[model samples]
Target: QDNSRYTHFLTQHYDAKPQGRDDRYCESIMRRRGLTSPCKDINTFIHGNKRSIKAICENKNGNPHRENLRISKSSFQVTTCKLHGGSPWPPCQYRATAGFRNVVVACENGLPVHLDQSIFRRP
Candidate 1:
């Protein structure tokens, strides 16, 4: 499964940390991660462990999107949520976190390359 590439995007676009405090954290990080323009309304980057994340790829039976056509697939998925119904500019609001999820990823070369779709496994 090619999950490495998608993981790279995750680390870039969704890498949220509390250490870097700023009034423009979203603006700065979003641009830095290359999610420019509308500033990605809702997105997620998984935290925790690298080993565990990688292991998801090895476990073949964990397929979440059973009905979708695959360019590739993995267990870690990140869904990109757009604005509900408002301005698609500077101010974008997202609210959610810290849930057990089965991440579905499309991959290339055992690393995630696209479609970061995290299925909620539990709360």
Candidate 2:
């Protein structure tokens, strides 16, 4: 299990380099959610992901410790503003956690359009 875990851990080195304000946006979103400290760093940012079905049912640690905790059982729905690109949720676009990835949904007029799970997929 540790071997597979390390294999998965090493893959994060190849994840896309953080671009622009995704870091600030992460911090701002967290602040709005009331977790005001331990903001993620842009250069070193790594997205949290949901565990596979078996892992959850079995309560296995899955790929990593960070990947197992603080995750939802189902796909999370997200929405945003079209004009200003502000989060549909006031004072927050949506919720986030150190143990999970930001759920991003393309929005127009406060309604979610297509859902993209790439944000949670293994890099």
Candidate 3:
């Protein structure tokens, strides 16, 4: 990760709001990290590690415009569209597949993470 953008990189999320579902979601990816809007449209942050950009949507706690898809097994994939970082209640599906045992951890629905930490920790 780039030390310059380290503030935005290590954070859990870059949320616009501080609290609530109407203004936020359960998980509130953006808000979780203390990221706010520039007072116009959603903003984008750079992930120095992956060179990918994480866009903060207009919905403070609303779901992203795009969908997050992941495959549990090599040929078996699951999709959870319109992911709202509102509440992580009932456990996020991604987390499940994140540490899901058996397969070689590749991309968790296309969202990558420190595979070393999430995968090996799984029992």
lDDT of each: 0.46, 0.31, 0.26
Write candidate 3's Cα lDDT for 26-116 as tens digits. 2244434443331211222212222222211112212332233222221211111122345444232122111113212123222333111
Candidate 2 yields a Cα-based lDDT of: 0.31
lDDT of 3 at 102: 23
Cα lDDT tens digits for candidate 1, 18-117: 3333334444555566664675655555554455454544444234355541322333323233333466665554334443345655544454545444
Worst 10 residues of 2 by lDDT: 76-85
Q: Where does candidate 3 have its weakest 10-residue lDDT segment?
A: 72-81
Q: lDDT tens digits, residues 41-109, model 2?
A: 211123323233223233242222243232323432232211123333433332222323333332222
* Residue pairs in candidate 2 whose N, alpha carbon or C atoms collide under 3 angstroms: none
In angstroms, the error of model 1 at 108 is 1.5
In terms of TM-score, the best-performing candidate is 1
RMSD of each: 6.0, 15.1, 15.2
